[PDB]
Amino acid sequence: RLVRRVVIAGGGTAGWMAAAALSKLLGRQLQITLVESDEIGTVGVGEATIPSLVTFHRLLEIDEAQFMAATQATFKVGIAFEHWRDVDRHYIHSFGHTGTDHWSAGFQHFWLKAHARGVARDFGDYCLELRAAQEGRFAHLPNGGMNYAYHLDAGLYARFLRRFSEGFGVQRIEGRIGSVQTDAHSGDIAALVLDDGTRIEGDLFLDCTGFRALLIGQTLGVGSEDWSRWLFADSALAVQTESVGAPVTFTRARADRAGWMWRIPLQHRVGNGIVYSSRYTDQDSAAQVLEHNLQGRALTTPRALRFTPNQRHRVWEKNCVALGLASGFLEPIESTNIHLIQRGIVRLLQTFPQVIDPVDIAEYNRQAAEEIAHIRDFVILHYHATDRRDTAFWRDCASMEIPDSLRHRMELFRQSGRVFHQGNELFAENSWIQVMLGQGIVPRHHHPVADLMGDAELSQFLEGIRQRVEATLARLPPHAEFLRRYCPAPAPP
Amino acid sequence: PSESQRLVRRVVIAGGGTAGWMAAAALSKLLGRQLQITLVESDEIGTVGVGEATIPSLVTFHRLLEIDEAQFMAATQATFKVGIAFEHWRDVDRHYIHSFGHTGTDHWSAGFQHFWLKAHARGVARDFGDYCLELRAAQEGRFAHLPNGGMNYAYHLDAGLYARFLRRFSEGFGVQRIEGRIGSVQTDAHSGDIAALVLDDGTRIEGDLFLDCTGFRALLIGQTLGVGSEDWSRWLFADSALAVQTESVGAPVTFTRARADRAGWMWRIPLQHRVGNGIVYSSRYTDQDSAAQVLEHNLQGRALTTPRALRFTPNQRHRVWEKNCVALGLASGFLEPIESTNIHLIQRGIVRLLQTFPQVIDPVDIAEYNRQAAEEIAHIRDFVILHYHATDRRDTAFWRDCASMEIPDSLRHRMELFRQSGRVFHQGNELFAENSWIQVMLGQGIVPRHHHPVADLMGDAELSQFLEGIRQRVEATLARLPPHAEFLRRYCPAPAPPAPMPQPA
């Protein structure tokens, strides 16, 4: 049966990112219908992103400045990780690349040798994007020389994508789903039945219904793998504050006693939140910690969220593809939520069915499983690589068993300073290095190629890199000045 | 134990030839100022006049080593290679080319083959090969470099001359060559590590890290350390070859020929002043005398050598790095030369070693090395199996068995993906690109039942205009390339041997 009708269950970022991409590419031959309820809204929730979204908008021919102005967006070049290695020990995990590699050995080997010889500055001084986070500067550079992403209002983003999608013929139906129907012989989803009795028939259904996974889970019975043995957070509180100064170019991830706090700058507001574990603390205490750390007064009543670190066992089952929370969830410590939605959509478009076949489904599921396990391991790394023993939460994080896949990467770096990137893993070599060095893993050896340079040659190699970083950084304007010239957003009412 | 005693300062390479001298060359180039590197080889071991085909990774190897391409080619009687002509694989008298490069133009949502498949269903497609420049250069016998690596290519070379060229390079970076035969291998009583080699004259060569380049003898990784190998003969039946050089009968073509027969296949490889030939076959399906007759029947020109008989078996060493020993080349495994992977697998073992080169040897480094090696070779294994399993042939028991055998699940999934939806993917550092999977599966008769629906957006005129614009760009580029022989004469002319010995007909 030819796939001619796609029904998207749920709106928000997952549903409207899917509608936007599907209608842009295939909307001239597909009937695309999205069902969502006006009773759900996310406007005024700030969210951080990663550079894959730049590519997504290139594929969709979305104008960056128009998108940013419509979503109150600012630029992002990294995440400032405060108090993770230990209290008062901070580092930045930035985009980009540090230093110059040799074909046999990455830059970190030269930096490690130089540091042992006392001729190295901080590892981050050799990375432009990291310095741009420290100094609050941003502009685009020729030939994609600046690696960046965005801080955005997720509700305004969904609204922008809705306008885009409706322009490519997406049919929006306002309502709630009262029943999901299956086919008696195949087990496929046949239709959704709305709360007014309307049956919406389709060939392929996207489950964007959130954490309940109404289609792939409650209807088709696909369970999820629970990761709470490794990842203890299960709660969040979020609140916006007034801006108190020019927008920084980084997201802040500030560890506390039993969780951590995000701070995300938008053009005229700041998004804040605390992520914590209900098995170690309670909502009242977390609200107190969040309030204590806010700059400026809160503008909204805090919004509470409950979640589980998890992954749907298969993200494509029969004629249903899950996206967003219905496919899984990891806390926003590395800003991966919108990325995982995008990956599910782009992979679906690259495997789009003429007819649906098990071999396509199996390949899709294999890729999704591999990609998410890699991101999970990197999230676990943030909690497990810590010197902190000051609360039960941190002692438990440091002492837990971890996936063998993560243990092997940590051991490789600890022994020989080596990191290796595979396939379509999200996190690049630079990310593994910045985070492991930043959180206190010290390689016992470095690559022998770095020992070929004497002290003066090695010091000059590093210093040349650092001078080029500083010379480039000096040409970049303050963030707020660039925003004003490139993508000024209207002041909220 | 002593920690300082763990530092790797002395590297001993057991065996010469391609494996040993490629290893010596790369290791001495990069680390010869810090390591004492010794290579042990016997003058009684080795064969003169082996012609071998390669793949584009060797171009990168020479860039890493700063080996000049024209000097290397002139020194090894080398010619250029843009692909392999596969004759009689899909069926008797049905041929195709597996080239380097990429066919057509992709969309971000769908590879070129989906547009070609739609065009074929609409009757507006030419042969798939017409949309690939390297393939057309194979058909027309043309070659030159193009700006920004616009031509993808590798080499046909004399392997013995290549090893001698690398020996000269290596000695220049300080490698110490010791001629002789290894009489025994000494191990450490407590660790089992290799401690030294002892030659037949009593010479003791100590080292910290040992590279086993001894071939099927596997003196270190096999005979000493006892690492077994995985048997792949349930999927791959060839175990024998006969090889012979012939005089050139014309200008050198730009492709390696892989011509299937009843129970094996034959290679034909052009060098600047001779041609390499061989038949690869299964002793379980035919005998040497019959294989010799088939080879003789297909030869062009007089033979320049007496045919040499070879034995082998498809396999991978269970671990290629064991304790302080790294196996390379035949000691690490073997696949038949159907996709010209022998020298590539040596290079990968060397490059991977240099990228994880030990200050001290540690199990986590060994484990990572072995994992990468195992994943890479299994992927190449599957592609070799694909050549035998994807066939219409039922005309001999050999082909019926190849078509009906069980295959690895990893290969079955790739074949089913293409058969159902025309889809291919490339993962990690797998050798074979999407273009390779597509050309070989289409060429050997896997017919996609569906294609990506994005191609259904194009009407016939738009689709034909898309394909014809690609074909016109291929043909305009091809018309600017000279005949292979003219390019060789100007770029890398090798001296003609003075006294070849053609045998009377």
Author numbering:
A (entry chain B): 11 to 503
B (entry chain A): 6 to 510
Give sentences copied directly from the paper behind this entry:
Flavin-dependent halogenases regioselectively introduce halide substituents into electron-rich substrates under mild reaction conditions. FDHs depend on reduced flavin adenine dinucleotide (FADH2) as a cofactor, which is bound by a dedicated subdomain. While BrvH preferentially brominated screening substrates, the X. campestris (Xcc) halogenases exclusively brominated them.
Xcc4156 and BrvH have short loops in both positions, resulting in a more open substrate-binding site compared with Trp halogenases and a solvent-accessible catalytic lysine residue. This can be explained by the lack of stabilization of tryptophan in the substrate-binding site. The FAD-binding loop (amino acids 47–56) of Xcc4156 does not have continuous electron density in chain B. Indeed, the loop is partly disordered in one chain of the apo structure and is fixed in an open conformation in the other chain. The asparagine in Xcc4156 is particularly interesting as its side chain occupies the position that would be taken up by the ribityl moiety of FAD in a FAD-bound halogenase, thus possibly hampering FAD binding. Thus, apo Xcc4156 crystals provide functional insight into FAD and bromide binding, even though neither the cofactor nor the halide is visible in the structure.
